[PDB]
Amino acid sequence: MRIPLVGKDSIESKDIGFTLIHEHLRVFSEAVRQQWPHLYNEDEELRNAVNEVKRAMQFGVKTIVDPTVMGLGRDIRFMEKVVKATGINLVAGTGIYIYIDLPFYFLNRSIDEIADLFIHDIKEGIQGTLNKAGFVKIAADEPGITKDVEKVIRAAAIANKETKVPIITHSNAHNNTGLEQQRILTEEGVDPGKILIGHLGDTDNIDYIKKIADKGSFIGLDRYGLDLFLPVDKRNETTLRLIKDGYSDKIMISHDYACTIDMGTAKPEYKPKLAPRWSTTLIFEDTIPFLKRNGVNEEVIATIFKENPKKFFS
Amino acid sequence: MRIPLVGKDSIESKDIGFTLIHEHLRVFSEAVRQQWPHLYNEDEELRNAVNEVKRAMQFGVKTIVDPTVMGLGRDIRFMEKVVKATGINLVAGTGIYIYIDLPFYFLNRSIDEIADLFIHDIKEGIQGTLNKAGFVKIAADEPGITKDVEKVIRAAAIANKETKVPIITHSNAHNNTGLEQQRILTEEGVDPGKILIGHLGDTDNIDYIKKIADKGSFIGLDRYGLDLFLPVDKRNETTLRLIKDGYSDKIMISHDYACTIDMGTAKPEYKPKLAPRWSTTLIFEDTIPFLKRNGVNEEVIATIFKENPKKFFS
Ligand SMILES: [Co+2]
Ligand SMILES: [Co+2]
Ligand SMILES: [Fe+2]
Ligand SMILES: [Fe+2]
């Protein structure tokens, strides 16, 4: 009715239920998998995603929002198979994930041409299917807001204005890329309440995080388990502080888990050190119980995982 | 034997015949094509490649070397189809084409892991087929020798020392990247005679061009027709001067034509302005006749287009 779902009829935002706002079923580099397929195994990848999703559902997760887009190996037909096997509500997205420059395809191409690609995914469908994009994903990281990064941001604003789908971002918590994404998007006419600034939970700099929330956007405390960015304990402490300071209606929580990911950083012998407890269920095992025994009312849990995602997609 | 060909038994390097050392059957950004297939037309692309190759063969071209690798949309099965329809000898390669950073896949991966990918293509086959790579292609441009660019250059050296296949490079004629590529490769123990420093025809600075030939590598006067980089008549005067100065033993000539290319810069609109006479038969129409009118004999032409490619692959 409003939010398109992979392999399902669209639904009203009020029916989204308990939601994980940022989780990846599978991530890979398009060019590498295309050039060297021997490196990948789809059977395992599907099995890994299906199993992970089933664990999440057993904890009550009703909807998963998967911001895998161009540059992370979005594959709508893979996503269909996971839904087919699990029955999860899956929201797919459109957009471009870059840190520095766009692919050469985009040389001498306008921001409008880029926005047109996103709009195609939202109105027509993804990768030749009738599965439609429910949001736009954009990124910026250590390199900052480069020329191409900015062009992609402004294209996302155009797509939002045309289709009203919200925007999810990837940012670096330590260099103000998040605040800049927000500024540019809102200058382009995007409603601040239609923006989730991502990976802000990677820092304990509470003052910076509040600055984005005060400007009306959702803040992504969304990498629970990725200790190399910030340990779980510190994340919980920051989350609790924000809630106590009255920021629960701006907070969104997730793991940014990748059921399978091809980056060398994700090698098995690195897990114990970088992300020992990383998964899509960590928050049920740690974060939520922690909050409840620290004076946080159930109503606040309901706000973060149900109400906020609802408003976001409304 | 010696040189592996797409869709054919390998051949002796002595039987390579008249060769175009740098031409592309098709170029595209892997990620863009994968995410937005609606932008592309396989049937038209095949038609374009087939017809162009046939025109080259009518002018005596026996072998085409196609340096389309990761980052340029290498597709071995598409290459097979063109071979079947034309009968051309086609040499495919392996390697990586980047200007700044490697794909995220390579985060926390060694230069050895990279080399292993090249050696896989050379020894086992490309993209799950039995078509083997006959050379390694690497690149550097305006941004210069970045850390990741340098990593790829060294992996190419490993692949060459292991398998003996030659290396073809892409460089920017104005920033010393070509000379730097040659230095790094030779320091790694690569035979200079197994290196083609590419795109040197983009400049008329013969002092710089000669510096590379003097160190033992082939020089790529390889973008005939691409006037936006350097107009035909200027390339001709440079080519002629080099021959007159005795450098025909290091000279290689080609067009770097792309029968189909998805970059905005290559739109049909811009062709008349940026590269009006660009194609795989330009050197037969203009360059070769021009050299002959200026006293260059048949032997020199045979040296450039038959003998040099032979040495390169020996
Ligand atoms: Co991210
Ligand atoms: Co090139
Ligand atoms: Fe993510
Ligand atoms: Fe080329």
Author numbering:
A (entry chain B), B (entry chain A): 1 to 314
The authors write:
Phosphotriesterase-like Lactonases (PLLs) are appealing candidates, being natural lactonases endowed with promiscuous phosphotriesterase activity. PTEs and PLLs belong to the amidohydrolase superfamily, and share the same (β/α)8 barrel topology. SsoPox exhibits high acyl-homoserine lactones and oxo-lactones hydrolysis abilities, and promiscuous, low phosphotriesterase activity. SsoPox is a very appealing candidate for the bioremediation of phosphotriesters because of its unique thermal stability, and its ability to resist aging, solvent and protease treatments.
Of them, the most active variants, αsA1 (C258L-I261F-W263A), αsA6 (F46L-C258A-W263M-I280T), αsB5 (V27A-I76T-Y97W-Y99F-L130P-L226V), αsC6 (L72I-Y99F-I122L-L228M-F229S-W263L), and αsD6 (V27A-Y97W-L228M-W263M) were subject to kinetic and structural characterization. Although the active sites of the improved variant structures superpose well onto the wt-structure, all selected mutants display altered loop 8 conformations. This emphasizes the fact that the improvement of the phosphotriesterase activity does not necessarily compromise the cognate, lactonase activity of the enzyme.
